[PDB]
Design a protein around this ligand. Structure first.
Ligand SMILES: *Cc1ccc(-n2ccnc2-c2ccccc2)c(C(F)(F)F)c1
Ligand SMILES: *Cc1ccc(-n2ccnc2-c2ccccc2)c(C(F)(F)F)c1
Ligand SMILES: [Ca+2]
Ligand SMILES: [Ca+2]
Ligand SMILES: [Ca+2]
Ligand SMILES: [Ca+2]
Ligand SMILES: [Cl-]
Ligand SMILES: [Cl-]
Lengths: 7, 230, 230, 7
């Protein structure tokens, strides 16, 4: 799973 | 249920709930604040997004655990499917709640590029989460709803924001994930991530130290995906 | 709300909820299983305890965050106190639910030492959590209810279990924490932890490799507290 | 804060 926006 | 609480108190309690890692409470407070009918400030939009992203993030993680167990069982009784369906219905309910706030009436009142792009990115994200669990006859329409929201946000962001703007970068990051994971378009995902990264790199020279930190943090996520995908 | 679900299905779903880290669901499933009226097996008691310990553990952590913010503010408006009170009332409700399951009717049906000690330890723990937030005129009675439950469990455990038995060790560990944090009796806490550790050490020679691992894990927690306290 | 029983 790739990264979507996160803090 | 928050109708009797002052807007300012709801915002204050949302911030306390964040500190306490009580994200369901945080989301309920922010829903109450939205329902006061006033536009949200930049800080308030961030609180709304953090609250619901954490709630739905936990639901998505649980759904993935249960879906994996269910798929291994199909390679027993109805319990795994029943419980996956319970979590799925809850997740869909949260997404519908967020989409309902955006449609009534955050998006239509959002005229500035920063607010409109923010809300359209949210709309794309929550349709994307619905698409992750969709299997019926409206799945193509759910995917197209996500695509349409992301595309409108992209069009505004390219016209109205610099390539380093954090919301423009996060939008492009998430639309790229949509292409890769939802739309079965890995080449589009890779192209978008690459073009976004390169155009941001070329604009970093205009930024202060603090803005540079904000932008490069999100650029690193684009790079992480490019490394995973290529 | 679980009255229409089979006992076995509730247990199965509790295990799925654990894997999915959905501890509120897990606790609701286990409450439903208890309310079927049958005694719980060793595995089922562990599921009940894990579910509620995780639910109340999150509430306690949130309460501590909010209580610290509130105390700094008292060194603004009513919001911090109001929200701390909301979390506190929720926490008290969960503790009351657990204590209600123990009183109706898990403890009275528990005749074997393993089950009775387990439930009395739980009773002490949930009164201890109530004591952590208590400030009114029943606080001394809440503390004494915790003490009485722990003491009865200790008396049974010393008569009926070897000093290395994991439930006996965990009970002594938690009663020691009660002495230190609740009863303002740090010397009693230290004495209990030391005597428990030493008596377990002297009994390790009787154990298989797997039982040795179980017992020494809890002995390490006793040692960690002794290191913190001395 | 000391350790009570944990998994
Ligand atoms: C979806 C998204 C993208 C970026 C950011 N972000 C990161 C750092 N700053 C910001 C930001 C600030 C102000 C307005 C919009 C975005 C977010 C975040 F705001 F949630 F952090 C979200
Ligand atoms: C309160 C407590 C103490 C010990 C244990 N524990 C740890 C390892 N095994 C056990 C155990 C097994 C069977 C019956 C009782 C205790 C627990 C735990 F069961 F929750 F793990 C709880
Ligand atoms: Ca008002
Ligand atoms: Ca407006
Ligand atoms: Ca039955
Ligand atoms: Ca019995
Ligand atoms: Cl279910
Ligand atoms: Cl409140």
């Amino acid at each position: 799973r790739p990264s979507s926006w996160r803090q | 249920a928050m109708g009797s609480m002052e807007r300012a108190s709801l915002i204050q309690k949302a911030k306390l709930a964040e500190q306490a890692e009580r994200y369901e409470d945080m989301a309920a407070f922010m829903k109450g604040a939205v329902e006061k009918g006033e536009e949200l400030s930049c800080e308030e939009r961030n609180l709304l997004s953090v609250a619901y992203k954490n709630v739905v993030g936990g639901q998505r993680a649980a759904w993935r655990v249960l879906s994996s167990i269910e798929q291994k069982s199909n390679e027993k009784g109805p319990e795994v499917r029943e419980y996956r369906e319970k979590v799925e219905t809850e997740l869909q309910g949260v997404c519908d709640t967020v989409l309902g706030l955006l449609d009534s009436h955050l998006i239509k009142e959002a005229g500035d590029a920063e607010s409109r792009v923010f809300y359209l990115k949210m709309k794309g994200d929550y349709y994307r989460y619905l698409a992750e669990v969709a299997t019926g006859d409206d799945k193509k329409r759910i995917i197209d709803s996500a695509r349409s929201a992301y595309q409108e946000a992209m069009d505004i962001s390219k016209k109205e924001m610099p390539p380093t703007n954090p919301i423009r970068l996060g939008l492009a990051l998430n639309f790229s994930v949509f292409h890769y994971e939802i739309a079965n378009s890995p080449e589009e995902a890779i192209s978008l991530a690459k073009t976004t990264f390169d155009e941001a790199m070329a604009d970093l020279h205009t930024l202060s130290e603090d803005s540079y930190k904000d932008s490069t943090l999100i650029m690193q996520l684009l790079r992480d995906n490019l490394t995973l995908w290529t």
